[PDB]
Design an enzyme around this catalytic site. Structure first.
Site, PDB file in Angstrom:
ATOM      1  N   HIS A 416      -4.350 -18.956  -3.332  1.00 56.31           N
ATOM      2  CA  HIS A 416      -3.940 -20.350  -3.645  1.00 56.31           C
ATOM      3  C   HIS A 416      -2.810 -20.791  -2.647  1.00 56.31           C
ATOM      4  CE1 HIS A 416      -5.644 -20.315  -8.113  1.00 56.31           C
ATOM      5  NE2 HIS A 416      -6.577 -20.188  -7.094  1.00 56.31           N
ATOM      6  N   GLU A 418      -0.176 -22.187  -2.873  1.00 52.46           N
ATOM      7  CA  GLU A 418       1.167 -22.073  -3.491  1.00 52.46           C
ATOM      8  C   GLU A 418       1.798 -20.548  -3.410  1.00 52.46           C
ATOM      9  OE1 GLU A 418      -1.086 -23.119  -5.035  1.00 52.46           O
ATOM     10  OE2 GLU A 418      -0.631 -25.253  -6.022  1.00 52.46           O
TER      11      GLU A 418
END
Ligand SMILES: OC[C@H]1O[C@H](O[C@H]2[C@H](O)[C@@H](O)[C@@H](O[C@H]3[C@H](O)[C@@H](O)[C@@H](O[C@H]4[C@H](O)[C@@H](O)[C@@H](O)O[C@@H]4CO)O[C@@H]3CO)O[C@@H]2CO)[C@H](O)[C@@H](O)[C@@H]1O
Ligand SMILES: [Ca+2]
Ligand SMILES: [Zn+2]
Length: 541
Positions: A416, A418
């Site tokens: 991901h 993030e």
């Protein structure tokens, strides 16, 4: 995957790598430790790739302009020389390897480009560029050319581009504005246009590389060339009667070469960090060490005060320092390689006719940036249509405010966006003595897990502020956990907001290769923005 109790060194092939290998021999005799000295092609490109996995050399030599990048990626060990040693070296050379509040490399020597003329063919070198055509005409009749230098590397043409007023990043009040790029300003175009006109008018060929020009001058075929200290050795071996003077002026103003500072940095993955320090401080950065190298191929004006006083008697070195003063020192910031890759494409294309000066320099300004395909931005940041991938645009600022880096990334390898940003900013290891503000422009809100890690990381780093602007909300249903994850982020101090036209407009002008085409809003933007804004307002209560 780096051998212990040994040193491997990477230096570029145009430097005195044999002279250095001898210092490794002296070092080996006084310690028993073998010192291998390799010089791979594109070592400056290879290093970050291998170093990121715990391989590579123990010491890398390159100009300092590439070290900010290496440092941001977390590839360099922090060098720590006592106050005694820092005195041995000129103050300004230490400043060339200062980044993020630390010292990241040892400066070795100052390099700068000079005009090199053949006294037998041209007893009086031209003071301006504008003479060179008439000079080339006068010489072509005798079977010779006037000037030949490497046109495949922007370093060698930069002095001419920078003269009238071209520059890389604007420098003001001790800091660099990474958003003020001057490769396409009036000056740049003027200097480059002169270069192209030389090629059009048959005074230079576009395909002339380093080896071609070096061979032309060393065989007395061209009256002039443009090169650095490292070149002087082979000019001696060829027994050409050469002088080393000032670069010609352009439109009255002096040519402004980028000044490099040859620098040794240490691989952070090295087990031999101590050995490297001992080698560089007590065997290379001495009188004996630098001489061994400077005899193989000249370094220019070394950083070592004691040995520099001796070298500065050389009239060749005098000219080098004269050009260096006229020019500027290269920034060491991570933006520099992108800038170099960009300017390279411009000069090649403009020189070969593939593009016009004005057109080439335009694209350079744009390429030096981390810019998205416009189709990808629209395809992904539409607040109404949910793609199965996430894009993250980011800006990292310093609150003194002043921006250090901006870019974009997408989820990759089942990882991901993030967590990818967390690695990028962890590796950077920002000076904790200052305060920073991270701004995300993301296409999806973060999943529940990533909301932990971003919250953890933010309580771990009190001096960072995070602002997330989002296009859509991911799994913000009541039968999903994500909504709390956004509260937990909010409670960790993060400012969450839904993107609006102002935000999409900014992103379009900042992270996208838009080609000046104005941002066209899609049907349902303003409605979707309003709806989501409330839906979020409902989550943070
Ligand atoms: O684009 C394809 C090329 O990619 C690679 O070249 C890149 C380098 O990786 C970049 O770092 C940069 O190079 C700068 C260099 O970093 C800068 O120091 C200066 O280099 C001087 C150096 O100071 C001097 O000591 C001596 O070595 O001459 C150098 C110039 O040749 O300027 C460089 C740029 O001119 O940008 C280049 C691309 O321009 C790769 O190495 C190439 O093989 C590849 O074709
Ligand atoms: Ca100056
Ligand atoms: Zn996630």
């Amino acid at each position: 995957k780096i051998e212990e109790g040994k040193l491997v060194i990477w230096i570029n092939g145009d430097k005195g790598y044999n002279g250095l290998a001898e210092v490794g021999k002296k070092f080996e005799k006084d310690t028993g430790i073998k010192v291998t000295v390799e010089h791979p092609d594109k070592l400056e490109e290879k290093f970050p790739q291998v170093a990121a996995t715990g391989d590579g050399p123990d010491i890398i030599f390159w100009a300092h302009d590439r070290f900010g990048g290496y440092a941001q990626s977390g590839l360099l060990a922090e060098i720590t020389p006592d106050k005694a040693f820092q005195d041995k070296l000129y103050p300004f050379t230490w400043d060339a390897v200062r980044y993020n509040g630390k010292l990241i490399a040892y400066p070795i020597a100052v390099e700068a480009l000079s005009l090199i003329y053949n006294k037998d063919l041209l007893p009086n070198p031209p003071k301006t560029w504008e003479e060179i055509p008439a000079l080339d005409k006068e010489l072509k009749a005798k079977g010779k050319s006037a000037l030949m230098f490497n046109l495949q590397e922007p370093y060698f043409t930069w002095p001419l581009i920078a003269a009238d007023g071209g520059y890389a990043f604007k420098y003001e009040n001790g800091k660099y504005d990474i958003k003020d790029v001057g490769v396409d300003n009036a000056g740049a175009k003027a200097g480059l246009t002169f270069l192209v006109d030389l090629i059009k008018n048959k005074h230079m060929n576009a395909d002339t590389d380093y080896s071609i020009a070096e061979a032309a001058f060393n065989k007395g075929e061209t009256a002039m060339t443009i090169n650095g200290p490292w070149a002087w050795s082979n000019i001696d071996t060829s027994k050409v009667n050469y002088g080393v003077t000032v670069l010609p002026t352009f439109k009255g103003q002096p040519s402004k070469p980028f000044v490099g500072v040859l620098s040794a940095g240490i691989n952070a993955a090295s087990p031999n960090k101590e050995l490297a320090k001992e080698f560089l401080e007590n065997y290379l950065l001495t009188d004996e060490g630098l001489e061994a190298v400077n005899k193989d191929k000249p370094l220019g004006a070394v950083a070592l005060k004691s040995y520099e006083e001796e070298l500065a008697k050389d009239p060749r070195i005098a000219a080098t320092m004269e050009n260096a003063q006229k020019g500027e020192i290269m920034p060491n910031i991570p933006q520099m390689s992108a800038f170099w890759y960009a300017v390279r494409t411009a000069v090649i294309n403009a020189a070969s006719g593939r593009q016009t000066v004005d057109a080439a320099l335009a694209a350079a300004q744009t390429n030096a940036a981390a810019l998205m395909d416009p189709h990808i931005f629209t395809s992904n940041f539409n607040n109404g249509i949910g793609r199965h991938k996430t894009y993250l645009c980011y800006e990292v600022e310093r609150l003194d405010s002043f921006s250090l880096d901006f870019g974009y990334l997408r989820n990759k390898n089942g990882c991901h966006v993030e967590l990818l940003f967390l690695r990028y900013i962890s590796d950077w290891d920002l000076d904790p003595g200052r305060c920073y503000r991270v701004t995300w422009f993301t296409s999806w809100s973060p999943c529940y897990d990533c909301a932990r890690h971003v919250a953890d990381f933010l309580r771990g780093n009190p001096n960072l502020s995070l602002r997330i602007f989002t296009a859509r909300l991911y799994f913000c249903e009541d039968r999903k956990a994500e909504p709390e994850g956004l509260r937990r982020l909010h409670r960790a101090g993060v400012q969450i907001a839904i993107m609006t036209f102002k935000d999409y407009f900014y992103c379009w002008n900042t992270f996208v290769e838009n080609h000046e085409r104005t941002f066209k809003a899609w049907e349902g933007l303003h409605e979707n923005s309003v709806r989501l804004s409330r839906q979020l307002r409902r989550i943070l209560l």
